[PDB]
Ligand binder design. Structure first.
Ligand SMILES: NC(=O)c1ccc[n+]([C@@H]2O[C@H](COP(=O)([O-])OP(=O)(O)OC[C@H]3O[C@@H](n4cnc5c(N)ncnc54)[C@H](OP(=O)(O)O)[C@@H]3O)[C@@H](O)[C@H]2O)c1
Ligand SMILES: Nc1nc(=O)c2nc(CNc3ccc(C(=O)N[C@@H](CCC(=O)O)C(=O)O)cc3)cnc2[nH]1
Ligand SMILES: [Mn+2]
Ligand SMILES: [Mn+2]
Ligand SMILES: [Mn+2]
Ligand SMILES: [Mn+2]
Ligand SMILES: [Mn+2]
Ligand SMILES: [Mn+2]
Length: 159
C-alpha cells in the first residue's frame, strides 16, 4: 500500500523557496518514526531540499533526467518508482507538491501534521476530498520550548 506523509501549515502550505519555514523537532521525530526501514519516494526538488540521503531508508528520487548520485535510486515515472520499492508492506511518499498530486489517488493512508502557523508559501498539499477519508488517529500538542507552534498529528485512512 501507498501512504503519504506531510506537514501542512495554514491553507495547506508545505513549502517556500524550496525550504520548510518552521522548526518542529517533535514533528521531524514523528517523520523518522513512521518512515524508518521503509522505502521513501520523493521528487527531485524535495531531494535537493533535504540535501542528503535519509539513513535507514531506501531513497527513491523521481526525475525526468539521469541521476547524479548512486547513494539513492533514480526513476523516471510513478510506476517505476513503485516497482523499485519491491514487495514491501508500506511505501512512504514524502513529497513534494507535484509528487503528492500524482500519488494521492493511489494512496490508502495519509500521515498529516497540522501546524498552527501562518506561512507564506509557494507549494501546497493537494486539496483532497474529505469525504473519501476517515480520521483514525489524532494527537494534539501545545507549543513548548522546543516547538514554537502547536501541532496536531493525524492519520487518515481511505474509506
Ligand atoms: N511540508 C512537507 O511535508 C513537505 C514535504 C516535501 C517537500 N516539501 C516542500 O515542497 C517543495 C518542493 O515541492 P515541488 O512540488 O516544488 O517539487 P517535488 O514534487 O519535490 O519535485 C518535483 C520534481 O520531481 C520530478 N518528478 C515528479 N514527478 C515525476 C514523474 N512522474 N516523472 C519524472 N519525474 C517526476 C521532476 O524532476 P525533474 O525536474 O528532474 O524532471 C519534478 O521537477 C519544497 O518547498 C519542499 O520544502 C514540503
Ligand atoms: N510530517 C512531516 N514533517 C516534515 O517535516 C516532513 N518533511 C518532509 C521533507 N523534508 C525533510 C527534511 C528533513 C528531514 C530530516 O532531516 N529527517 C531526519 C530527522 C530525524 C530527527 O530529527 O529526529 C530523519 O532521519 O528522518 C526529513 C524530511 C517530508 N515529509 C514530512 N512530513
Ligand atoms: Mn488566508
Ligand atoms: Mn552506477
Ligand atoms: Mn511486486
Ligand atoms: Mn503558531
Ligand atoms: Mn489537485
Ligand atoms: Mn466528509
Amino acid at each position: 500500500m501507498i501512504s503519504l506523509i506531510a506537514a501542512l501549515a495554514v491553507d495547506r502550505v508545505i513549502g517556500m523557496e524550496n525550504a520548510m519555514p518552521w522548526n518542529l523537532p517533535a514533528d521531524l521525530a514523528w517523520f523518522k518514526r513512521n518512515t524508518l526501514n521503509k522505502p521513501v519516494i520523493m521528487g527531485r526538488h524535495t531531494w535537493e531540499s533535504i540535501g542528503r540521503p535519509l539513513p535507514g531508508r531506501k531513497n527513491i528520487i523521481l526525475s525526468s533526467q539521469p541521476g547524479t548520485d548512486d547513494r539513492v535510486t533514480w526513476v523516471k515515472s510513478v510506476d517505476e518508482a513503485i516497482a523499485a520499492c519491491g514487495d514491501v508492506p508500506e511505501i512512504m511518499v514524502i513529497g513534494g507538491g507535484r509528487v503528492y498530486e500524482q500519488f494521492l489517488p493511489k494512496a490508502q493512508k495519509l500521515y498529516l501534521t497540522h501546524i498552527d502557523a501562518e506561512v507564506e508559501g509557494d507549494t501546497h498539499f493537494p486539496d483532497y476530498e474529505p469525504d473519501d477519508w476517515e480520521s483514525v488517529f489524532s494527537e494534539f500538542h501545545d507549543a513548548d520550548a522546543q516547538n514554537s507552534h502547536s501541532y496536531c498529528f493525524e492519520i487518515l485512512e481511505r474509506r
